[PDB]
Amino acid sequence: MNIFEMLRIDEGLRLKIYKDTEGYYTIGIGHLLTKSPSLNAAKSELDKAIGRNTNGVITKDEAEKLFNQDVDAAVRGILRNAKMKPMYDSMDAVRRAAMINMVFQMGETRMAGFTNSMRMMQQKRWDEAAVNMAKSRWYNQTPNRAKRVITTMRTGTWDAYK
Numbered sequence: 001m002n003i004f005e006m007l008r009i010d011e012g013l014r015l016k017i018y019k020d021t022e023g024y025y026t027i028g029i030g031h032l033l034t035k036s037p038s039l040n041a042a043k044s045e046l047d048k049a050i051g052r053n054t055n056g057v058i059t060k061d062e063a064e065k066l067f068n069q070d071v072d073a074a075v076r077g078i079l080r081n082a083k084m085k086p087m088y089d090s091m092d093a094v095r096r097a098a099m100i101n102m103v104f105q106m107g108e109t110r111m112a113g114f115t116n117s118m119r120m121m122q123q124k125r126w127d128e129a130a131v132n133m134a135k136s137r138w139y140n141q142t143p144n145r146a147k148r149v150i151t152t153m154r155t156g157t158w159d160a161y162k
């Protein structure tokens with residue numbers, strides 16, 4: 001179990017553009033194309049991502065490329081962050097893996113509503129951190145997967161991915 005195997009599970013593999021539970025155009029392993037009602041915008045976004053005229057479908061090899069970047073993107077923002085660096089650096093390899101998962105999924109911006117939890121976290125208040133976390137727009141649209149990341153954060157283990 002690693003970060004890639006981990007999001008892949010939670011993210012899914014789709015070679016055709018789609019909309020998430022939020023209604024946003026998306027492709028591959030959870031790669032957000034555009035929060036924009038326009039499919040065309042999404043397509044053009046897709047093409048830019050890939051650098052070729054897609055008409056909404058890609059190869060999984062293509063999927064995996066975005067996946068790399070995205071993953072890279074994530075870790076980088078954590079590490080590129082005043083508030084996050086200290087947090088990540090503070091954690092074990094697993095809870096770190098979970099941290100990437102969250103950022104990848106939501107993004108920095110949203111990540112910050114998560115400050116008290118990440119704080120409790122720093123206090124080792126897992127359980128509490130954990131119940132906190134569930135109380136969220138995030139955990140609410142996607143419980144199954146959010147339940148998994150939290151359990152992860154909480155236990156310092158991979159059981160939920162077992």
Ligand SMILES: [Cl-]
Binds near residue numbers: 093094
């Ligand atoms: Cl591990």
Ligand SMILES: [Cl-]
Binds near residue numbers: 140141
């Ligand atoms: Cl909801």
